[PDB]
Amino acid sequence: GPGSMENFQKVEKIGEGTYGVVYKARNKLTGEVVALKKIRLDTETEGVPSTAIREISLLKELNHPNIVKLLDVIHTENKLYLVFEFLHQDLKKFMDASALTGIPLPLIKSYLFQLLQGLAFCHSHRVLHRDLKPQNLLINTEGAIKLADFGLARAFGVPVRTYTHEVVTLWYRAPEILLGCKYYSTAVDIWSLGCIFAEMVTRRALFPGDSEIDQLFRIFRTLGTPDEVVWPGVTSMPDYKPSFPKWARQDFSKVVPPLDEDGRSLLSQMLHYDPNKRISAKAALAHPFFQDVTKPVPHLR
Amino acid sequence: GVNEVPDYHEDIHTYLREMEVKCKPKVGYMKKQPDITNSMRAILVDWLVEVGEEYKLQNETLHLAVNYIDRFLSSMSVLRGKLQLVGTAAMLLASKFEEIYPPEVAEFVYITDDTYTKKQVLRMEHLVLKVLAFDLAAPTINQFLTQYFLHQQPANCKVESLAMFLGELSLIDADPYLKYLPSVIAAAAFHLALYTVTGQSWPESLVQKTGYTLETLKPCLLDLHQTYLRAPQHAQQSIREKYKNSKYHGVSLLNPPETLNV
């Protein structure tokens, strides 16, 4: 890590996490525009946060065009700065600015294809992301979209062991987490990408629950209440309740009406109840939905 | 099923194989260390075994910690009075990386009998982070073992626990085990465990996965076999005590085989 804050010029604040603030900055020698994420250690009592230890350690290994690039780590006694490539916007902001036109299909398809490439690279390097949501997907002016915010991510072993429960922002959380399953795996990240796919088409969240049980109920009312046939094991899951209302599965044509047959096929395989049957990012890249895919620039400034 | 990541297990194994050579310590760092010995390191690792069992830490955490310690001591000369501080900061970092619920720093200060202050532990945390350049996602013996376990036909919990036990024994003794990669110690341990419990051998299927044969594993095997035989006499005993527990099927109580016929 060759950096030192003196070569950076702050430009504006661009956001904030539990971690602290993010600034856009400029490298005064090379010209490069970067995102600086500050982590406070003076205001830390437990030393370096585990969140930052995972983010830095895991992002150092993940060099891929659809994963935000950590360029550097400036590691004073007072402060820790993570230096990232700058990306101009997140997908949630872009969807809100695509309000009354929608995102054109070529762009949805390009974005979903890139996201799967990024996610497959993660999974191939034993990394679960565990917070895929539009706010955490960053877009540039050139048409790229990239996975970001790896503070909730985790290096897994094969087979997986029990990890932190109730990971993933609720609207994007997979049924197997909601039902308190002892184990979850790469399939939870696909579930989130499925929700994001649908959300790119409609511009609204697919399952906007207000509680764990409400989230489940919203899922069940769309995909049908799962039984042992669709999902062997489900009725034995720790937070499965036999009194769960038993909603019929609705035709996917009605879940996202504007989606074509290939789109529906792919979406359905991302949102399969059974984590073992849910499509992998690797296999999804071959889905016919992507036959005509291009990488066009975003249509908005 | 997806918990065994069928679509990524090979990519992952290949990647761990690349990463174990990068995260590998210097085989001969103890000679270049003036005030510390293999024997002092053995005492530290044995202690970290006890710390892990007291706080009910994952075994993966223990393995990571040893990885951090050995890499740190590969470039940083340390006085015997500070060896434990390194170890404590290593165990803290491993716990934050790997545990759902890491012990608090105060608990790490507590287990050192207030030999070190909180400020010392935190400062060392930063130093280890600087020395390792945050490269904490290191492959461990265990990450290879759990994959090897998927090749058992059928699965034997005594085989698995005994393999884990043997792999843990290897952490204690930098000589000879610094000279073997995690993937190879794991293979030796898996074969020795399997042979001891079921009489069977390193399977064809793991020859396909790893490229390792009993021929390429023989040197490590001969060492691990001696370590297993001598384990009741070793000065350090925390691992044997730990693997008497039923959690681990009491495998430390199994008798080692007298010969390998290998």
Ligand SMILES: COCCn1ccc(Br)cc1=O
């Ligand atoms: C050029 O000034 C160097 C110091 N610096 C620069 C940028 C940010 Br963001 C914080 C900070 O402290």
Ligand SMILES: COCCn1ccc(Br)cc1=O
């Ligand atoms: C989800 O991103 C929030 C924080 N962040 C992190 C990196 C970059 Br580049 C831009 C940015 O905004």
Ligand SMILES: COCCn1ccc(Br)cc1=O
């Ligand atoms: C059909 O069963 C209702 C189950 N339920 C409802 C509300 C809450 Br809060 C928890 C919970 O489990």
Ligand SMILES: COCCn1ccc(Br)cc1=O
């Ligand atoms: C177990 O061996 C006893 C020797 N010993 C004991 C404790 C500590 Br701390 C250092 C040390 O060298």
